């Protein structure tokens, strides 16, 4: 069970990260919301009781994550679970012949840094903290859960930057699982598609209400609580390792 | 034990005697019930120290040689982890061999015919023989038949392999090869066989008797084959080699390397490369 | 939750199917063991109590599965979950040039019959039984969980017949999910790796030991109760549909 | 190059198989058209000259394939390439609640028998004939190319039987490639999308032109000649083995 | 055919890039070697004649690539094909518990800068250059070929950074193919396995033989000329779009 575990939820102030913290704390675990200072995570940490604390840190910054991880060590003593949920997106297209517009390089770099490099930055730093834990009855020291996207497989038009970073997470989930296998750390990847997050509310409502009908079943937007349920399932299953789990309601993204 | 009554002047006498002996070594000394047998064993026990210290002296002499150069004096695709990767690769190949590979049988029913020196030497050849099977492109499915669990040969194999014994990808069993395989497909390889081995047959089980008789005992393997109804074959050493020197009974590591070459479509010219060159003057 | 659901488990007299019944029944659900008459499933059904019965049927026969489903509908009134675990395997190379042996057509046929069409034989028949169910609040009528293998992705030497059948289950998972999406039925597939089942136990003990040690983490054979845990997670997660989940502990099979 | 090579193309009387034979024969190779007696392959073989011969055989039967390969050995003396283009399809939903219609088990078995069982039956018998060939300078004895459409990955509504068969071919491509690696036979799989086969040109212009416009680029149905070009490319490349190649113009089939 | 086409080959002074340039120039096309100034590109371009020129540029810099593309337009007048072979490899474990060593972030960033970021920087810029081309009879304007690796699917221990960068290329290949489909530009990706590049040939002969033996068939390192052959096949085949082709001889890398 997840009772007593200490989880470091990256980007846990909203969306999938907040739902993951909401479920784990309710089940008896301890959570650390690792998000940006302006994200409003302090309110979320207070609402979740004394078992949740807020750690303001940028995932792209090595210094910020180390201080945030040290805060979890001070507050809870150990790190048992890491869930990487922070991520940004860009809707620019690679090249537009009609308008003579080319995907600017900084948009691709900025998305890659937060999504791909930021995820690896947390993974390698949390691996040192998880390496200090005593192996449990099954020899496990921790669980690292990454959040890719369905765009890593069938990304739409104008999602080249997002698919690249999400494809990288899918690409490196196995080597990291192999790297951390002697230590006893499981690495698993979730690939959600069209979830009822603030990301799926910035887009126009008519477009958003249309995508909800595109999902074969359930014909709606994914509830972030459903993502939180899958995260708990991955934690409690000792044999889930090195695999990417699509959680999309069987949708395949059209161009 | 009073057996010291021989060593404690045999050193002063002028014969070659080791300086460090234990009760376990001392016990095996008293089974030597003749002056020549004791002298021969002591000569072996003495030369153990002679090459030990000589190789011992060599290694820390090297330690000073490298430590002075090591202390005074990029883009990569793979971490330097090849010995681990090679062992895993041979493990996957060995697991496949244990399912679809051609069976090869080493008969362990020769424990009663071997002295302690010969029995120990059999394990050494067995270790090398199984090692060459692992590194081969198309390994055999090696069987250890007639291997008694408590027997002397089994205990020596366990001691040498230590932890690896339970993890070897070979089938060791108490039962005889006739119990595991049809008696028609079994061909007991022996140098005394009147039938010459012409071609390597992939639908047959070749049995090699793990017998190292330095005190040569001809016909022992043939007697076992004729005690059952097994067919026998002999290597065509006379057909392809001009023999001059030594016994025609090859070692177990040479035999398995000849069979492996034949199984990989090699001709007798390549297969008989592993017959020691000191015993013949070229292939004809 | 899973309490109150009725699950039809094919091949539930042993192996992964039996472990799924033990977990689901233990969680308050009702299970029907669908397996061969000589499989000894009657003893297992009595052991699991009044909430589990045994339906003797062969999945490759259309009439046999129809009898089992009627028995399940008679005893419990409705069918909510279908779990396909019945499967066989052979160890035969496609062609062995050295020994001059060609893979026989009957071995390929019988593996395809039991593993592939028998799985489809159950799916089409029970979906009619799920089709009679009234939708729940999310609009769901039932969940069908299939059992592929890692051989569907990296088959071993001599596993051509096994990989073709399990490969077929992976191929038809999404099309069936799309087929049954109008009527609110989720189709999910689990691809377990090496598990402590008699199918892999038939291998020599030294081969099993080597394979168990080759799993990166945990370095052991998959315990069947961990397969049952993943089945419960799929049943309880409404947004998991049309996806193949690998449960192999990050192992990739070399030839 | 392919000059002097002997290729046995199953289903070569029409569609992709015929296009492969025209290119290979036109490039100087010799082709053996293996198809049904009523397929009219004799007319196609006469048009292709003396380097092409028609061998009437049903791939589902081991007897007919053995005689067909005996005819290929008699006419040309050796077999170098096997191209499995024989296939059928069935469009039927798994279960229709509005109509109370269930997928017929005979239809599911029929598609598997030709698409999946027939492909393996050809492979296992052909591998015996390429096993007699002497390895070339690269150690290669023959090439086997299978056809398994994109339905194996993203099948459409009512394509469960067809996706199951094509999913099987994709799943078994690697184990067979590992099986025949000691021999020197390369096994490769092509996943064609929507091609201008006589099957697609049969359906009305409404679905014909719409599907052709659904391909991102080029926005047309695949030319069977383009299938033949990729078949020849696989033959000429020594390092292509155990891989599935999608030839679809980047189209992902929506439900 | 490829005669008369102009190819821009990043990293074309050595390895796969040089082999691609040699074949295309030999077949009658013109090539532009886009590589670092310190590489032997000037000597290589001279060796290939007047149809091949060397354009020094760093793929990570937008300004350097634009000058290289201007040079291609000046010398040859148009750009027809872009091949992205430039890339670096770094081996480093994510975390080593015994040694206390954590993967360095700057190691992760530089690999992502050249392999992932550099590949997309060329793609977005060269796409605008092909956007000025008049479509041919098929309506096509250019072909873009990216070079991922087998590490994008089965990365080994220590390849966390390399797999992530190569996995992202596999991620972007379909979304970019969707972006450029209206323009008429095809995007494809090749995933070479173990190839006889200077990176692998510099290794000791002891490990070179082992790597060659790990390939199922042919049991040798990939010939760079074989990569060039598959590049030509993608260019000539109009129906290859948005697909990753593994050219590895059916190898699956072990941990
Ligand atoms: N020339 C040869 N041909 C075939 N087998 C041989 C051989 N020389 C040795 N062997 C095999 O190698 C093993 C050890 S040689 C010992 C044989 C035994 N001591 C005897 O006198 O007959 C034997 O089991 C024998 O089968």
mmCIF file of N, CA and C in Angstrom, chain A residues 174 177-185 239 241, chain C residues 211-220 248-252, chain E residues 255:
data_model
loop_
_atom_site.group_PDB
_atom_site.id
_atom_site.type_symbol
_atom_site.label_atom_id
_atom_site.label_comp_id
_atom_site.label_asym_id
_atom_site.label_seq_id
_atom_site.Cartn_x
_atom_site.Cartn_y
_atom_site.Cartn_z
ATOM 1 N N UNK A 174 13.395 3.556 -20.475
ATOM 2 C CA UNK A 174 13.985 2.230 -20.342
ATOM 3 C C UNK A 174 15.452 2.288 -19.917
ATOM 4 N N UNK A 177 15.492 3.089 -16.321
ATOM 5 C CA UNK A 177 15.055 1.915 -15.576
ATOM 6 C C UNK A 177 16.158 0.872 -15.495
ATOM 7 N N UNK A 178 16.950 0.734 -16.556
ATOM 8 C CA UNK A 178 18.118 -0.136 -16.543
ATOM 9 C C UNK A 178 19.262 0.443 -15.726
ATOM 10 N N UNK A 179 19.447 1.764 -15.770
ATOM 11 C CA UNK A 179 20.482 2.403 -14.965
ATOM 12 C C UNK A 179 20.217 2.212 -13.479
ATOM 13 N N UNK A 180 18.965 2.371 -13.062
ATOM 14 C CA UNK A 180 18.596 2.343 -11.656
ATOM 15 C C UNK A 180 18.176 0.961 -11.174
ATOM 16 N N UNK A 181 18.215 -0.048 -12.043
ATOM 17 C CA UNK A 181 17.833 -1.394 -11.627
ATOM 18 C C UNK A 181 18.699 -1.957 -10.506
ATOM 19 N N UNK A 182 20.035 -1.861 -10.535
ATOM 20 C CA UNK A 182 20.812 -2.359 -9.389
ATOM 21 C C UNK A 182 20.474 -1.666 -8.083
ATOM 22 N N UNK A 183 20.135 -0.378 -8.125
ATOM 23 C CA UNK A 183 19.762 0.330 -6.907
ATOM 24 C C UNK A 183 18.435 -0.181 -6.363
ATOM 25 N N UNK A 184 17.487 -0.502 -7.239
ATOM 26 C CA UNK A 184 16.177 -0.945 -6.808
ATOM 27 C C UNK A 184 15.124 0.129 -6.963
ATOM 28 N N UNK A 185 15.201 0.880 -8.058
ATOM 29 C CA UNK A 185 14.285 1.978 -8.339
ATOM 30 C C UNK A 185 13.553 1.658 -9.633
ATOM 31 N N UNK A 239 5.969 -5.102 -10.120
ATOM 32 C CA UNK A 239 6.495 -5.591 -11.386
ATOM 33 C C UNK A 239 6.337 -4.609 -12.539
ATOM 34 N N UNK A 241 7.672 -1.754 -14.511
ATOM 35 C CA UNK A 241 8.975 -1.117 -14.621
ATOM 36 C C UNK A 241 9.352 -0.979 -16.088
ATOM 37 N N UNK C 211 16.617 -16.922 -16.508
ATOM 38 C CA UNK C 211 15.655 -15.932 -16.981
ATOM 39 C C UNK C 211 15.182 -15.035 -15.847
ATOM 40 N N UNK C 212 14.969 -15.609 -14.662
ATOM 41 C CA UNK C 212 14.543 -14.809 -13.520
ATOM 42 C C UNK C 212 15.599 -13.778 -13.145
ATOM 43 N N UNK C 213 16.873 -14.171 -13.168
ATOM 44 C CA UNK C 213 17.951 -13.249 -12.836
ATOM 45 C C UNK C 213 18.147 -12.165 -13.884
ATOM 46 N N UNK C 214 17.629 -12.354 -15.096
ATOM 47 C CA UNK C 214 17.818 -11.379 -16.161
ATOM 48 C C UNK C 214 16.825 -10.230 -16.102
ATOM 49 N N UNK C 215 15.762 -10.355 -15.314
ATOM 50 C CA UNK C 215 14.821 -9.256 -15.128
ATOM 51 C C UNK C 215 15.556 -8.151 -14.382
ATOM 52 N N UNK C 216 15.607 -6.931 -14.922
ATOM 53 C CA UNK C 216 16.373 -5.862 -14.270
ATOM 54 C C UNK C 216 15.936 -5.610 -12.836
ATOM 55 N N UNK C 217 14.660 -5.300 -12.637
ATOM 56 C CA UNK C 217 14.133 -5.154 -11.290
ATOM 57 C C UNK C 217 12.616 -5.282 -11.297
ATOM 58 N N UNK C 218 12.040 -6.128 -10.435
ATOM 59 C CA UNK C 218 12.720 -7.010 -9.476
ATOM 60 C C UNK C 218 13.300 -8.236 -10.166
ATOM 61 N N UNK C 219 14.469 -8.704 -9.736
ATOM 62 C CA UNK C 219 15.147 -9.819 -10.395
ATOM 63 C C UNK C 219 14.563 -11.154 -9.932
ATOM 64 N N UNK C 220 13.306 -11.373 -10.308
ATOM 65 C CA UNK C 220 12.599 -12.598 -9.970
ATOM 66 C C UNK C 220 11.466 -12.799 -10.962
ATOM 67 N N UNK C 248 6.458 -6.727 -17.108
ATOM 68 C CA UNK C 248 7.594 -7.608 -17.347
ATOM 69 C C UNK C 248 8.810 -7.230 -16.512
ATOM 70 N N UNK C 249 8.705 -6.159 -15.733
ATOM 71 C CA UNK C 249 9.833 -5.708 -14.946
ATOM 72 C C UNK C 249 10.984 -5.213 -15.797
ATOM 73 N N UNK C 250 10.658 -4.559 -16.913
ATOM 74 C CA UNK C 250 11.628 -3.913 -17.792
ATOM 75 C C UNK C 250 12.575 -4.903 -18.459
ATOM 76 N N UNK C 251 12.149 -6.149 -18.621
ATOM 77 C CA UNK C 251 12.965 -7.132 -19.321
ATOM 78 C C UNK C 251 12.716 -7.029 -20.818
ATOM 79 N N UNK C 252 13.777 -7.214 -21.599
ATOM 80 C CA UNK C 252 13.681 -7.346 -23.048
ATOM 81 C C UNK C 252 14.359 -8.648 -23.435
ATOM 82 N N UNK E 255 20.607 -4.985 -21.778
ATOM 83 C CA UNK E 255 21.009 -3.989 -20.778
ATOM 84 C C UNK E 255 22.514 -3.969 -20.543
#
